[PDB]
Design a protein around this motif. Structure first.
Motif, short mmCIF file in Angstrom:
data_model
loop_
_atom_site.label_atom_id
_atom_site.label_comp_id
_atom_site.label_asym_id
_atom_site.label_seq_id
_atom_site.Cartn_x
_atom_site.Cartn_y
_atom_site.Cartn_z
N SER A 18 0.83 -1.23 0.00
CA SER A 18 0.00 0.00 0.00
C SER A 18 0.86 1.27 0.00
CB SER A 18 -0.94 0.01 1.22
OG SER A 18 -0.22 -0.15 2.43
N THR A 71 -2.00 0.75 6.00
CA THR A 71 -2.70 0.39 4.77
C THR A 71 -4.02 1.17 4.64
OG1 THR A 71 -3.01 -1.55 3.30
CG2 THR A 71 -4.18 -1.67 5.40
N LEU A 72 -4.63 1.58 5.78
CA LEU A 72 -5.86 2.41 5.80
C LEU A 72 -5.56 3.84 5.32
CD1 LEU A 72 -7.56 1.26 9.21
CD2 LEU A 72 -8.34 0.78 6.83
N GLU A 75 -4.41 3.68 1.50
CA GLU A 75 -5.55 3.28 0.65
C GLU A 75 -6.65 4.35 0.62
OE1 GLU A 75 -7.08 -1.13 -0.05
OE2 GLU A 75 -7.83 -0.48 1.89
N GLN A 76 -6.71 5.19 1.67
CA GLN A 76 -7.58 6.38 1.70
C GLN A 76 -7.01 7.48 0.77
OE1 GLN A 76 -9.77 9.27 5.09
NE2 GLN A 76 -7.74 8.48 5.58
N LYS A 79 -7.82 6.31 -2.60
CA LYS A 79 -9.25 6.59 -2.83
C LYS A 79 -9.43 7.99 -3.45
CE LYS A 79 -13.67 7.16 -0.23
NZ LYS A 79 -14.50 6.74 -1.38
N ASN A 139 -12.07 0.26 -1.65
CA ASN A 139 -13.07 0.96 -0.83
C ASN A 139 -13.81 -0.07 0.06
OD1 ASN A 139 -14.63 3.83 -0.71
ND2 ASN A 139 -16.17 2.21 -0.66
N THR A 141 -12.39 -3.00 0.89
CA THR A 141 -11.34 -3.48 1.78
C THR A 141 -11.20 -2.53 2.97
OG1 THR A 141 -9.61 -2.51 0.40
CG2 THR A 141 -10.00 -4.85 0.05
N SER A 142 -10.86 -1.24 2.70
CA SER A 142 -10.67 -0.21 3.75
C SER A 142 -11.87 -0.11 4.70
CB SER A 142 -10.38 1.17 3.11
OG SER A 142 -11.41 1.55 2.21
N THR A 146 -10.93 -1.21 8.52
CA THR A 146 -11.02 -0.23 9.62
C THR A 146 -11.96 -0.73 10.73
OG1 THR A 146 -11.24 2.16 10.18
CG2 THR A 146 -12.92 1.27 8.67
#
Length: 155
Positions: A18, A71-72, A75-76, A79, A139, A141-142, A146
């Motif tokens: 990520s 990774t959050l 990955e945000q 996004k 989206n 996954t996150s 979370t």
């Protein structure tokens, strides 16, 4: 502890991937981004289809809490960044791809339209669909990542 060790290695992959494909996303390296996409999303999928084992100690939980947190964030940032990219590409497809109007005939030969139109459409449509399937999955996954993060960290 097989379930526990494979848990460690794969979450390690998810955070490293990520971070690095985020470096590639901001660099505009789409080729490299999409090479990492398949391994990244598949790593998230395989840990959640395997499901987090109950045998995770405080040290291992702290490691993967860091990995999910990384990774959050990354990955945000994917996004928002890829939302910009897909919006631009989609607006380009809305002009170059003749789905009927703006054309004397209907170009029904999708993936083989006569003219350079087929080439410019094929590029924008490929880049769109690749970053788009990436987005829908990243989206999803996150979302569950979370939820699992908040629980795994503070049950």
């Amino acid at each position: 502890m097989t379930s526990t060790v494979e848990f460690i290695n794969r979450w390690q992959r998810i955070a490293l991937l990520s971070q690095s494909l985020l470096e590639l996303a901001q660099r505009g390296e789409w080729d490299l981004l999409l090479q990492q996409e398949v391994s990244y999303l598949q790593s998230i999928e395989t840990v959640m289809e395997k499901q987090t084992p109950p045998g995770i100690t405080r040290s291992i939980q702290d490691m993967v809490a860091g990995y999910i947190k990384q990774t959050l964030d990354n990955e945000q940032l994917l996004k928002g960044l890829l939302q910009q990219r897909l919006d631009e590409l989609s607006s380009l497809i809305g002009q170059v791809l003749f789905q009927g109007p703006s054309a004397g005939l209907v170009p029904r030969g999708s993936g083989g339209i006569e003219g350079s139109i087929d080439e410019t459409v094929a590029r924008y449509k490929a880049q769109f669909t690749q970053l788009d399937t990436m987005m829908s999955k990243l989206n999803n996954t996150s979302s569950y990542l979370t939820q699992q993060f908040t629980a795994m960290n503070k049950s």
